[PDB]
Amino acid sequence: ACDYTCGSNCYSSSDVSTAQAAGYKLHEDGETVGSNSYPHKYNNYEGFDFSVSSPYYEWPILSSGDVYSGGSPGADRVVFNENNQLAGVITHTGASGNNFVECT
Numbered sequence: 412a413c414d415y416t417c418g419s420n421c422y423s424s425s426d427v428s429t430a431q432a433a434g435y436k437l438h439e440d441g442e443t444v445g446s447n448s449y450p451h452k453y454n455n456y457e458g459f460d461f462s463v464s465s466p467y468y469e470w471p472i473l474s475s476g477d478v479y480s481g482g483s484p485g486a487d488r489v490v491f492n493e494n495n496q497l498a499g500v501i502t503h504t505g506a507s508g509n510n511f512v513e514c515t
Protein backbone atom coordinates (compact mmCIF):
# COMPACT_ATOMS: atom_id res chain seq x y z
CA ALA A 412 0.00 0.00 0.00
CA CYS A 413 1.05 3.63 -0.50
CA ASP A 414 2.57 5.71 2.27
CA TYR A 415 1.46 8.80 0.33
CA THR A 416 -1.04 8.80 -2.47
CA CYS A 417 -0.98 11.83 -4.75
CA GLY A 418 -3.96 11.34 -7.07
CA SER A 419 -2.97 8.11 -8.89
CA ASN A 420 0.70 8.25 -7.88
CA CYS A 421 1.90 6.00 -5.05
CA TYR A 422 4.92 6.75 -2.87
CA SER A 423 6.62 4.84 -0.05
CA SER A 424 8.55 6.66 2.73
CA SER A 425 11.76 5.62 0.96
CA ASP A 426 10.66 7.44 -2.23
CA VAL A 427 10.03 10.53 -0.15
CA SER A 428 13.31 10.36 1.76
CA THR A 429 15.18 9.95 -1.51
CA ALA A 430 13.61 13.02 -3.23
CA GLN A 431 14.04 15.06 -0.04
CA ALA A 432 17.74 14.21 0.38
CA ALA A 433 18.24 15.43 -3.25
CA GLY A 434 16.20 18.65 -2.83
CA TYR A 435 17.98 19.54 0.41
CA LYS A 436 21.56 19.13 -0.87
CA LEU A 437 20.82 21.46 -3.83
CA HIS A 438 19.27 23.87 -1.31
CA GLU A 439 22.40 23.75 0.90
CA ASP A 440 24.57 24.19 -2.25
CA GLY A 441 22.48 27.12 -3.57
CA GLU A 442 21.92 25.20 -6.79
CA THR A 443 18.63 25.13 -8.68
CA VAL A 444 17.31 22.78 -11.37
CA GLY A 445 14.45 23.05 -13.89
CA SER A 446 12.61 25.94 -15.48
CA ASN A 447 10.81 26.51 -12.21
CA SER A 448 14.17 26.58 -10.41
CA TYR A 449 13.78 23.80 -7.84
CA PRO A 450 14.12 23.58 -4.94
CA HIS A 451 12.46 26.99 -4.36
CA LYS A 452 10.58 28.57 -1.45
CA TYR A 453 7.10 27.28 -0.56
CA ASN A 454 4.99 30.09 0.82
CA ASN A 455 2.19 27.85 2.11
CA TYR A 456 -0.55 30.03 0.55
CA GLU A 457 -2.81 27.00 1.04
CA GLY A 458 -2.45 27.25 4.79
CA PHE A 459 -1.44 23.68 5.48
CA ASP A 460 -0.97 23.08 9.21
CA PHE A 461 2.53 21.55 9.06
CA SER A 462 4.06 20.38 12.36
CA VAL A 463 7.61 21.44 11.40
CA SER A 464 8.58 25.15 11.19
CA SER A 465 9.10 27.59 8.37
CA PRO A 466 10.63 28.46 5.96
CA TYR A 467 9.60 25.65 3.62
CA TYR A 468 11.00 24.54 0.27
CA GLU A 469 9.36 22.38 -2.38
CA TRP A 470 11.07 19.85 -4.61
CA PRO A 471 9.36 17.55 -7.14
CA ILE A 472 8.97 13.83 -6.46
CA LEU A 473 8.52 11.76 -9.65
CA SER A 474 6.29 8.73 -10.22
CA SER A 475 9.15 7.12 -12.15
CA GLY A 476 11.18 6.65 -8.92
CA ASP A 477 13.87 8.83 -10.43
CA VAL A 478 15.28 11.88 -8.68
CA TYR A 479 14.37 15.17 -10.29
CA SER A 480 17.04 16.49 -12.63
CA GLY A 481 15.21 18.97 -14.91
CA GLY A 482 12.50 18.56 -17.52
CA SER A 483 8.89 18.28 -16.41
CA PRO A 484 8.38 18.32 -12.61
CA GLY A 485 5.05 16.52 -12.73
CA ALA A 486 2.41 17.59 -10.15
CA ASP A 487 3.84 16.08 -6.91
CA ARG A 488 6.12 17.82 -4.40
CA VAL A 489 8.01 17.06 -1.24
CA VAL A 490 8.08 20.09 1.19
CA PHE A 491 11.05 20.17 3.59
CA ASN A 492 12.33 22.93 5.94
CA GLU A 493 15.70 24.54 6.76
CA ASN A 494 16.43 21.73 9.24
CA ASN A 495 15.79 19.10 6.53
CA GLN A 496 12.55 18.05 8.33
CA LEU A 497 9.71 16.69 6.12
CA ALA A 498 6.68 19.00 6.33
CA GLY A 499 4.48 17.04 3.89
CA VAL A 500 3.83 15.69 0.41
CA ILE A 501 1.51 17.75 -1.79
CA THR A 502 0.17 17.83 -5.38
CA HIS A 503 -1.64 19.97 -8.05
CA THR A 504 -3.54 16.74 -8.80
CA GLY A 505 -7.15 17.34 -7.84
CA ALA A 506 -6.48 21.00 -6.91
CA SER A 507 -7.74 23.69 -9.33
CA GLY A 508 -5.15 25.68 -11.24
CA ASN A 509 -1.78 25.86 -9.55
CA ASN A 510 -3.27 25.23 -6.12
CA PHE A 511 -2.08 22.25 -4.07
CA VAL A 512 -3.83 19.59 -1.96
CA GLU A 513 -2.16 17.16 0.45
CA CYS A 514 -1.27 13.57 -0.61
CA THR A 515 -3.02 11.00 1.58
Ligand SMILES: Nc1nc2c(ncn2[C@@H]2O[C@H](CO)[C@@H](O)[C@H]2OP(=O)(O)O)c(=O)[nH]1
Pocket residue numbers: 447452453454455456457469509510511
Ligand atom coordinates in the same frame (compact mmCIF):
# COMPACT_ATOMS: atom_id res chain seq x y z
N1 LIG B 1 -0.08 27.14 -4.92
C1 LIG B 1 1.11 27.56 -4.47
N2 LIG B 1 2.03 27.90 -5.32
C2 LIG B 1 3.16 28.33 -4.71
C3 LIG B 1 3.38 28.42 -3.36
N3 LIG B 1 4.67 28.90 -3.18
C4 LIG B 1 5.17 29.08 -4.37
N4 LIG B 1 4.32 28.74 -5.36
C5 LIG B 1 4.43 29.13 -6.74
O1 LIG B 1 3.47 30.19 -6.94
C6 LIG B 1 3.07 30.18 -8.36
C7 LIG B 1 1.57 30.03 -8.43
O2 LIG B 1 1.15 28.86 -7.73
C8 LIG B 1 3.95 29.12 -9.05
O3 LIG B 1 5.16 29.76 -9.42
C9 LIG B 1 4.22 28.16 -7.87
O4 LIG B 1 5.33 27.35 -8.18
P1 LIG B 1 5.28 25.78 -8.21
O5 LIG B 1 4.35 25.41 -9.34
O6 LIG B 1 6.77 25.45 -8.72
O7 LIG B 1 5.20 25.15 -6.91
C10 LIG B 1 2.36 28.04 -2.46
O8 LIG B 1 2.32 28.02 -1.20
N5 LIG B 1 1.20 27.61 -3.09
